[PDB]
Design a protein around this ligand. Structure first.
Ligand SMILES: OC[C@@H](O)[C@H](O)CO
Length: 315
């Protein structure tokens, strides 16, 4: 019979919106019904959504948490009712969950900042666009960015602020920074591609181009920016793969089947060197890719390498 898995995401970001197709594909191949909800970047709303899924007696719950330091009563309630609660993509600061399917966000932060350090030759002024404040990917990517910045004291941070993963909020923040700092800005380090693209749109609207921008995710428009040189690079977080892996882990936990409950998604570097294959998987041959996805996920669960999808460089 049908395994009902609740999924409550922080918001319908570009990453989550594209990723969900991977979840759908794995679910069709495994008779899983997804019970969906999005929490508007509101912790109390997400809490209520988890509570509702518990009351509905779903077989497992995936949470993509608004903030890391939250949801303790929902975590305990799920455990109390025997329902596996599995943070996927963003993390909770709790060990009372049933599984945990996460990217290495500290590593991705460091990787993006290292791309920017290389481009700049270790010197220059940057601004940093952050994810939602208190969300694990914001905290972790900040940590990784700061660990590289320590190694490059001639790189100076002019400002940093959140744009909540959103392109339109990033345009706004960048427009203000252009008015404040103008020609001092030598680079933009965006904690995701969407915010990088907003920064790009702001720069262009002010008549400035060729400013180095780096992002994380490799969404369609980010990959396109890498190809065209509007971005210096990105880090692939293919949500069709990572979210389907989280779904697979939750499904096996729901059914009492043996599984690695805590695989980690290592984001490969995307540059002009390998962007074409990423574009094939994510954009132009996406249906080919999805046709092989269930097999890929099932293998990757046993190797632990849940990011593997044959991007040149991966082994
Ligand atoms: O889903 C949260 C992050 O992993 C993602 O990078 C946001 O675009």
């Amino acid at each position: 019979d049908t395994t009902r898995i609740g999924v409550t995401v922080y918001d319908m970001s570009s990453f989550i919106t594209a990723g969900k197709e991977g979840m759908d594909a794995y679910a069709k191949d495994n008779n899983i019904e997804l019970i969906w909800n999005s929490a508007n970047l509101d912790v109390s709303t997400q809490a209520s959504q988890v509570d509702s899924m518990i009351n509905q007696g779903v077989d497992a719950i995936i949470v993509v948490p608004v903030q890391a330091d939250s949801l303790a009563p929902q975590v305990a309630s799920a455990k109390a009712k025997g329902i596996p609660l599995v943070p996927v993509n963003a993390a909770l600061d709790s060990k009372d969950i049933a599984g945990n399917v996460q990217p290495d966000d500290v590593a991705a932060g460091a990787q993006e900042m290292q791309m920017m350090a290389d481009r700049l030759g270790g010197k220059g002024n940057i601004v940093i666009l952050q994810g939602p404040l208190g969300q694990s990917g914001e905290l972790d990517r900040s940590k990784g960015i700061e660990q590289v910045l320590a190694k490059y004291p001639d790189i100076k941070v002019l400002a940093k602020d959140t744009a909540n993963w959103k392109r339109d909020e990033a345009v706004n923040k960048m427009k203000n920074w252009i008015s404040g700092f103008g020609p001092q800005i030598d680079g933009v380090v965006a904690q995701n591609d969407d915010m990088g693209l907003g920064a790009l749109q702001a720069l262009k609207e002010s008549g400035r181009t060729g400013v180095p921008i780096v992002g994380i995710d490799g969404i369609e428009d980010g990959l396109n920016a890498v190809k065209s040189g509007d971005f210096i690079g990105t880090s692939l977080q293919n949500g069709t793969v990572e979210l389907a892996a989280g779904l697979a882990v939750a499904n096996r936990l729901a059914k009492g089947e043996p599984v690695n409950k805590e695989p980690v998604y290592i984001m490969p570097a995307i540059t002009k060197d390998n962007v074409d294959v990423a574009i094939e998987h994510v954009v132009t041959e996406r249906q080919q890719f999805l046709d092989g996805l269930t097999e890929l996920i099932n293998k990757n669960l046993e190797t632990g390498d849940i990011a593997y999808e044959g991007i040149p460089g991966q082994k």
